[PDB]
Amino acid sequence: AQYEDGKQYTTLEKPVAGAPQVLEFFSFFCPHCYQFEEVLHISDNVKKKLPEGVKMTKYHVNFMGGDLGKDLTQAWAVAMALGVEDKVTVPLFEGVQKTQTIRSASDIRDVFINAGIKGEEYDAAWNSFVVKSLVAQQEKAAADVQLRGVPAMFVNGKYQLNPQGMDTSNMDVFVQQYADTVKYLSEK
Numbered sequence: 001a002q003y004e005d006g007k008q009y010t011t012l013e014k015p016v017a018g019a020p021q022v023l024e025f026f027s028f029f030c031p032h033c034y035q036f037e038e039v040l041h042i043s044d045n046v047k048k049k050l051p052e053g054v055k056m057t058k059y060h061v062n063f064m065g066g067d068l069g070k071d072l073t074q075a076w077a078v079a080m081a082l083g084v085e086d087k088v089t090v091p092l093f094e095g096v097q098k099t100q101t102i103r104s105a106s107d108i109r110d111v112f113i114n115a116g117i118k119g120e121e122y123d124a125a126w127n128s129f130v131v132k133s134l135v136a137q138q139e140k141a142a143a144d145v146q147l148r149g150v151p152a153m154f155v156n157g158k159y160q161l162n163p164q165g166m167d168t169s170n171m172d173v174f175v176q177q178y179a180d181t182v183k184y185l186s187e188k
Contacts, residue, residue, distance in 0.1 A: 019157025077134035
């Protein structure tokens with residue numbers, strides 16, 4: 001077959017019911033995640049090829065970067081609640097991995113302030129029980145699929161993208177293959 005279990009994707013022997021249609025996991029500490037976002041724009045190219053009536057979800061994980069990793073998961077919850085994901089994703093990636101100017105929760109906060117979210121607004125969100133449940137959701141979704149590595153994408157709670165089995169000579173061909181795989185799995 002052109003798409004084979006175990007080649008462009010793997011199948012969860014323990015399928016997750018009620019799961020989001022397209023579910024991505026990342027960490028701001030994760031080097032391939034940095035590429036996926038800034039160089040490859042995976043999420044965006046997947047969205048462009050998906051049918052529609054299909055929603056895309058992206059969650060942060062705790063297992064990298066210890067205490068700061070958990071802060072970043074809460075901050076991503078703040079980003080989701082306020083709907084400012086597209087304004088903070090790149091400066092969070094560069095603050096953690098490029099400039100190394102993110103070393104504390106106050107530094108994460110600065111990224112939001114500089115992106116124009118108001119102090120008042122960020123701190124209220126940060127402390128809100130809407131953000132608490134949102135952090136819980138990120139953890140539960142990761143827990144549901146035994147997640148030990150990122151970047152990771154899961155379709156319909158039963159298939160997991162496997163980028164290691166796609167060509168990487170050409171960044172653009174890699175992305176189309178990844179996106180076309182998501183679409184194929186979507187239609188499956």
